[PDB]
Design a protein that fits this description.
The structure is a homohexamer.
Chain A: H1 2-36
Chain lengths: 37, 36, 37, 36, 37, 37
């Protein structure tokens, strides 16, 4: 109940964080490419 | 209980971290766009 | 217990990480603003 | 169970995040190298 | 035992990650300061 | 078994993430140093 619910909230937050980390990684690659020329 | 309470604190910290990671990603996209 | 104690340490590390991620996000926004002009 | 299932989802999200963090680290190293 | 042990390893990895995130945040602030000036 | 196994996978992913975060922090420090002069 309480434990399962907290774990579901943790899972959801980590999914959102993973998506944002992916988007950030792509942008960082674009920065590297722009600075290389 | 003690386990449930710790897990709620973990959930809250991860929610805050997810929000900050999103804001960082948006700003990094803006940097990429400015440099392109 | 041992499980509760480990979870408290996890909570504390995640709180510290969240604070640092927020500070980093703010600085990244400032970089974006400086590069936009 | 419900607990096991949530933990499997947590594991999967963290695997994806670890991969992205690695890719980001490599790109950040390339930025450092470009700037000198 | 197995659960407690895994949780201790998780705690340790998160402590290391938090320290590195803090150091990164400081460096990002320095980047922002350099680009503002 | 299932809970312990998921926790071991979580531990392993977090170890990998910590290593990458450390490498990223070092590179960010190098960027700060390059931009400072």
């Amino acid at each position: 109940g309480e434990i399962a619910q907290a774990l579901k909230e943790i899972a959801q937050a980590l999914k959102e964080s993973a998506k944002a980390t992916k988007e950030s990684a792509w942008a960082t690659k674009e920065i590297a490419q722009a600075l290389k020329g």
